[model samples]
Target: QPDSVSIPITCCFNVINRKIPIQRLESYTRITNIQCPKEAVIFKTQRGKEVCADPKERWVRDSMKHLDQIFQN
Candidate 1:
């Protein structure tokens, strides 16, 4: 049996009105209003594919980790 699961991710392209480009910050509160499944995993369905879900695969990790590290700063 194939082992694969989907994960949810959201990307944001923020537009801020300003005279000059200024530093901006984003904040949000997460809410889990309903029950969710446990033991979910996301995988790469094929080579050169974007990870649309989670528990993600190794390539996805390597690619996305760069973004994660950037935000950590």
Candidate 2:
């Protein structure tokens, strides 16, 4: 089953201190602190690239809200 061969049980180990352009991101996934030491957000770009960054960053939260609104309507 693909479920048996599912994703890896890893978390974000390295995070960036800089802001990423929101326009380049297509979606995002938040990493929980309970699962790992660092709280982070994984942003997926239009080109299918992953960007790891601090979850509490202003730009991170702003991008999340912007993405949320995009898929809502």
Candidate 3:
């Protein structure tokens, strides 16, 4: 049997400068140079909204890494 489906590739064109406050944080996605023009992190909040940030920002990587920790623990 064969089924058809589609994949969604989220793209980000604009990025922010602030370290996102993750009190309502849920998950995230990375937009790399391969697809989008900029390397960004899309942070999914408690409300299911996506917030894009610069990957070069220290907090962006740290917060994402900590999110990984929460699920692993």
Candidate 4:
């Protein structure tokens, strides 16, 4: 079931020098454990890799709002 999925979703990453790091994964990976620290959005890959993105990014901001709504209800 994992391999058939085209996209993986996960979250987690370490902040450094006021920027988040990202890399291209060479193979299929699962994503899980998303996190938010106000300043940044963090996620991980199925391979246990961490990636951090700016919270101000449009996608991140939008996702945050969705999360907020889900938590409120």
Candidate 5:
């Protein structure tokens, strides 16, 4: 018999913006959203690829907040 259950994989770029390459996710451990000293938000993907996004952008702030929530729980 084979496994019947499969985890749904979603790309961070799909949910956010494609400022960076799409990140493949098996779980939430790979995605990282952080604030930068340069006043930008960095989105670090599963492959260690990072992208700079405007901190003032709603999406960037929202994503960062969302990631913070996940990590807190």
Candidate 6:
């Protein structure tokens, strides 16, 4: 019986950047793949410094935050 259940979707940026697709990671992490509107960004934590040269800071954070909000809801 399928009544009404809230399906949870999660998007997570992998720490180790490999050829692994988001779908595979999501399955491995036990998270349903709803929609990943934003691509993953790479931020190097080198020399105790956070360097976000990929998608910039604001954009990256904003996208992640948006996804997070969806998850929370």
Strongest candidate by lDDT: 2
lDDT of 1 by residue, 1-73 (tens): 3443335433322211222111221111122323343222222222423223222235333444443443421
Model 2 C-alpha lDDT per residue in residues 13-62, reported as the tens digit of each score:
88877888888888888887465778788888888888888877788899
Q: Could you tell me the TM-score of candidate 1?
A: 0.24
Give the range where candidate 2 is weakest over 10 consecutive residues by summed lDDT: 1-10
Candidate 3 residues 11-62, lDDT tens each? Answer: 7888876766867677887887466787888888878888998878888888
Q: Which candidate is the best by TM-score?
A: 2
**lDDT per residue (tens digit) for residues 2-64 in model 5:** 553343432234243443323231112333333213344456655755555655567566566
Q: Per-residue error at 18 for model 4, in Å?
A: 18
lDDT, candidate 4, at 38: 35
The residue ranges of model 4 lying beyond 4 angstroms of the native Cα positions read: 1-38, 43-51
The per-model lDDT (C-alpha) reads: 0.28, 0.80, 0.76, 0.42, 0.45, 0.34
Model 4 per-residue lDDT tens digits across residues 22-44: 23221222223344223455544
**TM-scores, all models, native as reference:** 0.24, 0.76, 0.73, 0.31, 0.43, 0.22
lDDT-wise, the better of 3 and 4 is 3
Give per-residue lDDT, candidate 1, residue 57.
Answer: 37
Q: What TM-score does model 6 achieve against the real structure? A: 0.22
Q: What order do you get sorting by TM-score, best first?
A: 2, 3, 5, 4, 1, 6
- Any runs in candidate 6 off by more than 4 Å, and if so which? 1-56
Sort every candidate by lDDT, greatest first.
Answer: 2, 3, 5, 4, 6, 1
The collision pairs in model 4 are 9-31, 10-32, 11-42, 11-43, 11-44, 12-42, 12-43, 30-46
